[PDB]
């Protein structure tokens, strides 16, 4: 196909030699889902600005307002290094010698009487 032969070149440019045949079919299904939610929001933004033609600033708005919600990322390095030094300053606690099975408080564990219904 046309758009499915370009999908095998996006993977081969990323060095993906081996892949399942259903991999191309659902990256096209995601790419179709992504462009019919940019352009669906683009004509919502065009009707907000009251213009009959969806021009390039509408797609510039609908991309950056969908990428502000959908595609997130891990926390940044200046945020990870601040919560590290706030946590790594606290000294390590000592251990009670014969406390038993060392566990968190019981509202943080998964150890409850764990009931079930009576069969009748």
């Amino acid at each position: 196909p046309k758009d499915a032969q370009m999908m095998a070149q996006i993977l081969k440019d990323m060095g993906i030699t081996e892949y399942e045949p259903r991999v191309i079919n659902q990256m096209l299904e995601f790419a179709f889902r992504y462009v019919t939610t940019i352009l669906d929001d683009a004509k919502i933004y065009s009707s907000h600005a009251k213009k009959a033609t969806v021009d390039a600033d509408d797609v510039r708005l609908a991309i950056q307002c969908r990428a502000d919600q959908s595609f997130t990322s891990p926390p940044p390095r200046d945020f990870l290094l601040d919560i590290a030094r706030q946590r790594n300053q606290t000294p390590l606690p000592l251990i009670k010698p014969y406390s038993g099975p060392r566990l968190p408080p019981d509202r943080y564990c998964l150890t409850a009487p764990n009931y079930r219904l009576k069969s009748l």
């Binding site: 940044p76 390095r77 990870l80 030094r85 060392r102 968190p104």
Partner: protein, 545 residues
Amino acid sequence: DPTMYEEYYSGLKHFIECSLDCHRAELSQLFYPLFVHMYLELVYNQHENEAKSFFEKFHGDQECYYQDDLRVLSSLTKKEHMKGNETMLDFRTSKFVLRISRDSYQLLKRHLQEKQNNQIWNIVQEHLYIDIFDGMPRSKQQIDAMVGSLAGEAKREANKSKVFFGLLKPNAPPQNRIPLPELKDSDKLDKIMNMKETTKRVRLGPDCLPSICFYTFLNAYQGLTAVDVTDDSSLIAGGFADSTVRVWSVTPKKLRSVKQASDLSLIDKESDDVLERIMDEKTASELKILYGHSGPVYGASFSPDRNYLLSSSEDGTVRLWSLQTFTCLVGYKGHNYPVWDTQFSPYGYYFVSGGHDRVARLWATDHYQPLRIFAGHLADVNCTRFHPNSNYVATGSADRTVRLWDVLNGNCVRIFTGHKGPIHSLTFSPNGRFLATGATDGRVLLWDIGHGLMVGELKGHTDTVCSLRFSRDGEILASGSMDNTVRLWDAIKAFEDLTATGHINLPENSQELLLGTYMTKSTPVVHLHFTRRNLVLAAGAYSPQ
């Protein structure tokens, strides 16, 4: 400025390749960081056409080991594409370290302090550190051995901190440095039968090559993603892609749960049998399946007292499974992201888990929150390994660096760079002096820990080296990779020699350090284990492929 970046970079490319060959191989190190820092500054200032032209003109003169980063960069053409990458965002703000000699830096600074090239000199002194050592300029096959990371080849001032790399009972830490747990009478009973196994332990060396017992997972149509074996070869755990952990007993002794609370209330304590009395014989299988992860289990770690299985998965939780009740006890939710590895401490109280959120957390099985956050990596923390004294945590990662972290203060005390792919295996020497790391380039790099210097490079494997272990004596390092081979390396002849130049001349001796290579039948060697009588165990799902 931006339209003449192909004139600044090509001028410095013309100066370096016209230099003499002793300084040319060392001055070729600043091709890659000046190519990326000029390309990422073009796309951050919204100069896409010029960025694309720079990438096309200079991407192919970059070293072959950098193809993956180069492909991620070829995708990055917009500013907002890079504003949510968080690896090139941390590459743009950090400084490339670029260890160069003073004999080659004098030729570089005599070509940059002049006004003819004051723009590429302005990019160098803004985006690049330069760490100068007084010595010989390194060869090209020695520079190739120690570069490969992003913001790589770190300073010698990082690798000069005092590391207590010795074992517990002038390099050993005190016993009260890290508050380690007590040694109980059941834990002291374990070491009594452990030294009976040490009596039958064979000296391996280069002559008495060990026997390898492969524990293959035959059907495994849910993909096996994690294996662990206990310290005595008694249990084998399997983490699978169908969100299950499966414990197998390998000794002829079925897996039993302890009795319920009604049955324990009628028996008495203080009896000699006690543990035997508590076991339930109604529940006795050769296989126990553990449910509760909502995602593929990627880490698996036993505790040294043979209770307390650990497992981490894609759903962002680390789970502590009991091996006396065979239920889940705690779910440690600190990552929102796939936790790629976990490991218990060799004393069994603390555990470290590294995830996709580019940190490694230190937990203690007593707090719902971590104690130490090791947050200096720029990509995913793929591996997390404890030191044999458990005062130090080694975290390999996907930004091609291995970092040692002190458990006190959470400080990075060593940075080991020189891998070309993401590190997928770490192991420590039983001395505590050395550290073997493996990655996707098929290279096993042997690092010193006191000197912070790589001491050897083992380059026999072809695909990703996913499992390493030293022997119980330290005589042999066993390596297992995706080429379905278990290679054995001489881990005594590799450490026969024990600076201020911050590097040693690596020997190119891999051929003499290979004692043997054994090929698996279509089976990637996921785990490698050494029995206390020095017998190699290996586990891998058989994939016909």
